[PDB]
Amino acid sequence: SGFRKMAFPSGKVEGCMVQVTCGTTTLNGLWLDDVVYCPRHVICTSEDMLNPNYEDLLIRKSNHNFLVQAGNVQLRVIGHSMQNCVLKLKVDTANPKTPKYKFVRIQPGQTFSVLACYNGSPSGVYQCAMRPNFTIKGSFLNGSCGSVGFNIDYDCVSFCYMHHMELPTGVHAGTDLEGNFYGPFVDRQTAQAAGTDTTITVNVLAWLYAAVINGDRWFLNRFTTTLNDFNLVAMKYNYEPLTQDHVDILGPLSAQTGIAVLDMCASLKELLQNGMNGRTILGSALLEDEFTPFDVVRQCSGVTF
Amino acid sequence: SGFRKMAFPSGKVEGCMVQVTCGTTTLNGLWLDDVVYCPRHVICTSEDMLNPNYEDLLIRKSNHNFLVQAGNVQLRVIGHSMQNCVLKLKVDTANPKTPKYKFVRIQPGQTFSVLACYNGSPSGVYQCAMRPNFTIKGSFLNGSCGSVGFNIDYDCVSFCYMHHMELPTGVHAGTDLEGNFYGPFVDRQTAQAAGTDTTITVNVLAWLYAAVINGDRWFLNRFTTTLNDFNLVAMKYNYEPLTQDHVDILGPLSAQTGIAVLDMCASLKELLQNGMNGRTILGSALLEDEFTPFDVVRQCSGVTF
Ligand SMILES: CNC(=O)CN1Cc2ccc(Cl)cc2[C@@]2(CCN(c3cncc4c3CCCC4)C2=O)C1
Ligand SMILES: CNC(=O)CN1Cc2ccc(Cl)cc2[C@@]2(CCN(c3cncc4c3CCCC4)C2=O)C1
Ligand SMILES: [Cl-]
């Protein structure tokens, strides 16, 4: 029993974290085989950030202008190239701790673990989700850029996020490991803001199924709803539309508990229209949306890595 | 910016997890140097739990009755002894991945990271606190026994918890790494139950200081309180008594924000009386008590917004 926001074991990623320093800027890099991946803004000063021409800033740099430190060992940069908003530093040493890995681009609603780093040294691990507005609600201070997000499937690390910046509301924006931003953000000091966010409906439903699995059943009722009527209600509370794909994905949880997806949608409709009335679900007074259907199944089954 | 329940990077602990098998029982062990530490109930059957005589069950076992597996390698047991509720298995191989470590017994209110494991393989990492009633609100299924709790201040791992059991309310009980239980719990299937739990007051105060540091003051008021009057109010809400030690410990957070401890106590009294009135503090609609003053200082910016 129990239900916690659980992150993946971070060891396979800790062995890839390095410090990258170019000029007066210092941030984190991901060292996989003989390449170190880091945000391209490592080549920028504060004034450059206002309107940077990255290709022009990069051409003026040599390999010895980049200082890469892995623990207390200095790695030698022997090549450099840019791919979208990510700088790729070719180093003379392959990482002996390189795990089996893939670079994957995630969709909004999907969760991942973040290994927060400062000066190439990991400080903490936490779980979060890609919001519908493509921002993440992370915990990052200055020096955290280059921190990565990932998931694990058996022995393989799927790197999905690299930290680049913080928006005015305190939320975070970054890229996949190919340097493509999530959301309409650009890597420069210009007016940028998170769009209006919505609640990840399929994730709230998965967390309601987790509450039922753990013994919390007060919100269940005799009623059902159509998918269209549920979406008409959800749209009014800034909840994401629930699709037939979402109902299919909730199937295993609908089978383990004996509660149909539309049966559970009628419970969420009542919670949206009445609130919790002084009660909690899994120790929370808010409807939680940062656990996917897969996270619920994995935590209520004991999947190992 | 941001504030998350953050766990320590688990890599140093992942390299110590092994599988211990005795007869038909299989659980987790912690391999440090040439010793594997695991719960002594690994030598018990389900019937043995009603009234186990551990000394009598242990004397009938030889070294080769214990199967220790580290990854896909079988370790050889060359000695066994019992220390309180833990079994210590002397193995012929020292763990080459043994980190710098200490065994520390924690007090109620203190937090730690848990690396949940099944069959010697880590599955997830989450943060939690030793409750005032000496239980933890973990997430553990059958096969998780022997999973450990730890802190990693500097490069040293301080092991503080080993998982042994789940109580009727779904909370968890275990020992320090010397085999001494936290709480009046026994590794016997008795009518033991978790005592009435209370809120960790010093931790709620620390989290209110974190909210102020992150730029939020809506909950503050122009009032102050004596320590005794605050405790008379707090105990009516099942909050732990706040001691002068707790006041001293909150000093740095009080200095960084300019808000006196007894003035933050007055905001807490008012929040208990009024609720949040549709507002949240650091993304939560409940008063959070699983962040110590030390965790807030570790995570938050040294500069108040
Ligand atoms: C909040 N941002 C700023 O004050 C200026 N920022 C311009 C800027 C412009 C484009 C890009 Cl791609 C990055 C950046 C910076 C680089 C570092 N960074 C950042 C990242 N994570 C967390 C925190 C920060 C800044 C201090 C608060 C915590 C940014 O957003 C800095
Ligand atoms: C709920 N308790 C039981 O079913 C019987 N349990 C008596 C018992 C009595 C004393 C001791 Cl020290 C151990 C134990 C067991 C050993 C394993 N275990 C356990 C541990 N963590 C999580 C979960 C469990 C059981 C299934 C639910 C998840 C226990 O409590 C077994
Ligand atoms: Cl302590």
**3-class secondary structure for B73-109?**
EEECEEEEEEECCEEEEEECCCCCCCCEEEECCCCCC
Give the position of tokens 């619920």.
A296
Q: Which of A264, A154, A155 shows the shortest CA–CA distance to A206?
A: A264
Residue of chain A whose Cα is closest to the Cα of B276: A285
Say whether A163 is catalytic. no
Are residues A51 and A109 both part of a single domain?
no
d(CA A189, CA B88): 58
Which of ligand 2's atoms lies nearest the C-alpha of B190?
9
Q: Do A77 and A132 share a domain, yes or no?
A: no
Query: What is the identity of the amino acid at A202?
Result: V
Q: What is the DSSP string of A44-94?
A: --HHHHTS--HHHHHHT--GGGEEEEETTEEEPEEEEEEETTEEEEEESS-
Task: Please tell me the distance from the alpha carbon of residue A41 to that of residue A103, in angstroms, as a whole number.
Answer: 20
**Measured between beta carbons, which residues in chain A are less than 8 angstroms from residue B283?**
137
Alpha-carbon distance of B278 to B290, in angstroms, equals 22
* A116 and A239 assigned to the same domain: no
CA dist B264 and B300 (Å) reads 18
Q: How far apart are CA B126 and CA A207, in angstroms?
A: 17
- Strands (DSSP E) along chain B, which ranges? 17-22, 25-32, 35-39, 66-70, 73-75, 77-83, 86-91, 100-103, 111-118, 121-129, 148-151, 156-166, 172-175
Characterise B118 by phi-psi region: left (phi > 0), alpha (psi -120 to 50), beta (else).
Answer: beta
Full domain range(s) for residue B33: 15-99
Domain boundary among B197, B213, B232: B197
The minimum-distance atom of ligand 2 relative to the CA of B189 is: 9
Encoded tokens for A184: 């309409």
Residues B253 and B288 in one domain: yes
Ligand 1 mean position, distance from CA B5 (Å)? 22
Reduce the DSSP state of residue A284 to 3 states and report it: strand
Cα(A172)–Cα(A118) distance, integer angstroms: 16
Quick one: tokens of B240? 């732990």
> Nearest-CA neighbor of B175 among B70, B52, B37, B46?
B37
Q: Does B85 lie in the same domain as B116?
A: no
From B11, B139, B144, residue closest to A6, measured CB to CB: B139
Largest Cα–Cα distance of chain B, in whole Å? Answer: 69
DSSP state of B256: H
Q: Determine contact: A60 vs chain B, CB below 8 A.
A: no
Tell me the count of A-B CB pairs closer than 8 A.
Answer: 131
* Catalytic residue list of B: 41, 145
C-alpha to C-alpha distance for B283 and B280, rounded to whole angstroms: 5
Taking the C-alpha atoms of residue A22 and residue A57, their distance in angstroms, rounded to an integer, is 12
* Chain-chain contact of A6 with B124 (C-beta, under 8 angstroms): yes
CATH number for position B242: 1.10.1840.10
Please tell me which residue in A22, A38, A128, A145 is annotated as part of the active site. A145
Q: Which atom of ligand 1 is nearest to the CA of A165?
A: 30
Structure tokens at A299: 């935590």
Closest CA to A89 of A74, A103, A100, A79: A79
Minimal Cα–Cα distance from B56 to chain A, Å?
A: 32
DSSP output for A215-270: T--TT--S----HHHHHHHHHHTTBPPPPHHHHHHTHHHHHHH---HHHHHHHHHH
Header resolution in angstroms: 1.8
Taken in order B166, B167, B168, B171, the sign of the CA dihedral is: negative
Same domain, residue pair A95 and A106: no
> CB-CB: which of A125, A137, A299 is closest to B125?
A125
Residue B45, token pair as written in the block: 């059957």
Q: Cβ of B139 and A166 within 8 Å?
A: no
**Cβ neighbours of residue B115 under 8 Å, at least 6 residues apart?**
A9, B10, B13, B14, B17, B122, B124, B125, B147, B148, B150
Q: Give the closest-approach CA distance of B123 to chain A in angstroms.
A: 4
* Residue A107 identity (one-letter amino acid): Q
Helix B261-274 vs helix B201-213: angle between axes, to the nearest 10 degrees?
100
Residue A143, H or E segment: none
Residues A187, A215, single domain; the answer is no
Overall size of chain A counted in residues: 305
Contact A14 B15 (CB under 8 A): no
Contact map slice: B 7-46 vs A, CB within 8 A: 7-12, 14-15
Number of domains in chain B: 3
- Tell me the one-letter amino acid at B110: Q
Contact of B182 with chain A, judged by CB distance below 8 Å, is answered with no
Give B280→chain A minimum CA distance, Å.
10
From the list A6, A124, A141, which residue is nearest B9 (CB)? A124
C-alpha closest to that of A143 among A42, A259, A237, A62: A42
Q: How far is B257 from chain A (nearest CA, A)?
A: 18
Rounded CA-CA distance B240/B219 in Å is 21
Using DSSP bridges, classify how beta strands B156-166 and B100-103 pair: parallel, antiparallel or unpaired.
parallel
A184, A208: one domain: no
Experimental method: X-ray
**Which residue among A99, A125, A152 closes a domain?**
A99
What is the signed CA dihedral for B21, B25, B27, B30, rounded to 10 degrees? -40
The amino acid present at B91, given as its one-letter code, is: V
Structural contact between residues B150 and B157, judged by C-beta atoms closer than 8 angstroms: yes
- The number of beta carbons lying within 10 Å of the beta carbon of residue B218 is 10
Domain CATH number, residue B170: 2.40.10.10
Same domain, B182 and B202: no
B130 Cα to the center of ligand 3, angstroms: 9
Q: Which residues in A33-71 are b (16+ Cβ under 10 Å) and which e?
A: ebbbbbbbbbbbeeebeeebebeebeeeeeeeebebbbe
Q: Do A280 and B301 touch (CB under 8 A)?
A: no
DSSP state of B42: G
Q: Which two tokens stand for residue B147?
A: 């999973």
Interaxial angle between packed helices A261-274 and A227-236, expressed in degrees from 0 to 180 and rounded to the nearest 10: 30
Cα angle for residues A78, A80, A82 (degrees, 5° grid): 165
Ligand 1 centroid to A187 CA: how many Å? 10
The full 3-state SS of B265-283, as one line of letters, equals HHHHHHHHHHCCCCCCECC
DSSP helix, strand, coil percent of chain B (3-state; round to 5): 25, 30, 45
Residue B221 CA, distance from chain mean position: 33
The DSSP element (H or E) to which B171 belongs, if any, is none
Same domain, A7 and A107: yes
Helix (H) or strand (E) segment spanning residue A35: strand A35-39
Among the three residues A168, A197, A226, which one is the final residue of a domain in this structure?
Answer: A197
CA–CA separation, B267 and A248 (whole Å): 47
Dihedral of alpha carbons A46, A52, A58, A60, sign: negative
Q: How far apart are CA A268 and CA A271, in angstroms?
A: 5
CA distance B195 to B197: 6
- Beta-carbon contacts of A301 under 8 Å, excluding residues fewer than 6 positions away, are B141
**A1 part of contact set with chain B, CB < 8 Å:** yes
Q: Are A93 and A75 in contact (CB under 8 A)?
A: yes
Helix, strand, coil percent values for chain A (each to nearest 5): 25, 30, 45
Whether residues B147 and B8 share a domain: the answer is yes
Question: Which residues in chain B touch residue A280, judged by CB atoms under 8 angstroms apart?
Answer: 286
Please list every residue in chain B whose beta carbon sits closer than 8 Å to the beta carbon of residue A124: 6-9, 299
Q: With contacts defined as CB-CB under 8 Å, which chain A residues touch B144?
A: 302
How would you classify the pairing of strands B77-83 and B86-91?
Answer: antiparallel
My answer on whether B204 and B294 are in the same domain is: yes
Q: Could you say which of B8, B11, B122 has the minimum Cβ distance to residue A15?
A: B11
Answer yes or no: are the C-beta atoms of B76 and B70 closer than 8 Å.
Answer: no
Q: Are A298 and B117 in contact (CB under 8 A)?
A: no
Contact between A7 and B5 using a beta-carbon 8 Å cutoff:
no
Cα(A39) to centroid of ligand 1, in Å?
12
CA dist., res. B286 & res. B191, Å (int): 32
Which residues 208-267 in chain A show a CB within 8 A of chain B? 214-215
Atom of ligand 2 nearest to the CA of B186: 12
Atom of ligand 2 nearest to the CA of B85: 12
Rounded to an integer, what distance in angstroms lies between the CA atom of residue A92 and that of residue B209?
47
Residue A265 sits at φ, ψ, to 5 deg, of -65, -35
> Quick check: A82 and A54 in contact, CB under 8 A?
yes
